[PDB]
């Protein structure tokens, strides 16, 4: 039988948790692979909707109706009906997701193959959001203990791989669903998932040809990995923004004083050599992002160039100008250590964090630390475990953090996740908006992005968002990165690549297109 060796997320050890709602404790082969979505949007191809469990959807003259494919059965033989979708959306309406429920007011079963979704506000992006919610078996989950602390070790599933073949703390094997509706399109028998804690461990394995489908950072990829075998390939199409995020609500006076000063964020930004960061840390694998709004050149067409030009000096390498701005603002060194102190005369050191084992970001931070020291800003690096890293952002105890962002077909994915202040509160919230900068006009502009179908007005919305973020230098954007993807042609063929660019190729959870991707691979 064919086994596909994948690596969607680093772990020290595997805990048997296949619950789709628990995205902080589950295995990252649960969404898509076990619970197939209604629709997959091919974001690389203009969000073209690829229909799976749903046959179609129809916005009413305004709310949506989904039609659900017939003859579709769960893993245990029981049939997939509207009742299963109905029971699923119903369940998060009274037990909160991460997806966000701020868009759907209840659900009607209307037909055992048609479901009515009632809308809170009106949003043309709402099928994209509905697609994120996992549909679970009604005939199974309606039992359940506490649906919130429920490991799902033996999962009833709709997706391609539902059988747990093997399960050690360093290896688990996830095999073909017995009653899979698309099994005719499926030629991979099993997902084979090894436990890998960080990039150093990954690197030995990938260079030894032990992997099939991976998305980790690989330093000097052409020398280390590609040169080791003719079967060793990769394809890095462009992805989203990377930046230093600063905490506007730091609990230390001096640090708060520094971080909340726009002069100081702009001097911080100007000391950075973004091209050198790309060159050394990412081995050339990226593009300088000198948009103060973090827009990035892939969305250059969306850009109000007046705004970009106006603030780009603040987002270009200019240590001398960084030194002058610090002095004009009042960050004077008054204790003879060569490091500027706050206007009220306090010494400080910024602690800059990135996740343990994400060595590309670790190196970016260490590069920035030295760059900062050159213009007299004192900083130190920290590389905590992702969960610690993430937690420090959620509770606002960090100073400065290097982070990447998710990336969409337009700039809304980046701008909303990164700046909508409503995403600063909750408890299943991601790290992305946790600078705690807040602007009602910015939030209003974001909230109205998909409110009108006037492309011209949507574009004026973008320019208004761009201007607000840029003039306030809310973060320090550094670069635009790549979709890291490595593939082995030793055991399989049919891979997406530069010659076959059918969509986002990565294996990470959060890329629904990985389902469509595995449906193209054939054993060799
Ligand atoms: C936007 C986001 O949070 N994406 C996450 C990915 O960055 C992350 O993958 C890891 O990214 C690091 C930084 O570039 C790499 O150093 C690292 O190799 C890579 N790890 C893997 C297994 O791909 C993944 C997984 O941690 O989570 C994504 O959500
Ligand atoms: Ca000093
Ligand atoms: Cl800009
Ligand atoms: Mg196929």
Residue numbers in the entry: 1 to 61, 64 to 98, 102 to 529
Reproduce the article's own wording on this structure.
VhCBP is a periplasmic chitooligosaccharide-binding protein mainly responsible for translocation of the chitooligosaccharide (GlcNAc)2 across the double membranes of marine bacteria. The chitooligosaccharide-specific SBP is localized to the periplasmic compartment of the bacterial cell wall and serves as a mobile component of the (GlcNAc)2-specific ABC transporter. SBPs share a common structural feature comprising two domains connected by a flexible hinge region. VcCBP and VhCBP belong to cluster C/subcluster IV (C-IV), members of which are specific for oligosaccharides, including mannooligosaccharides, cellooligosaccharides, and chitooligosaccharides.
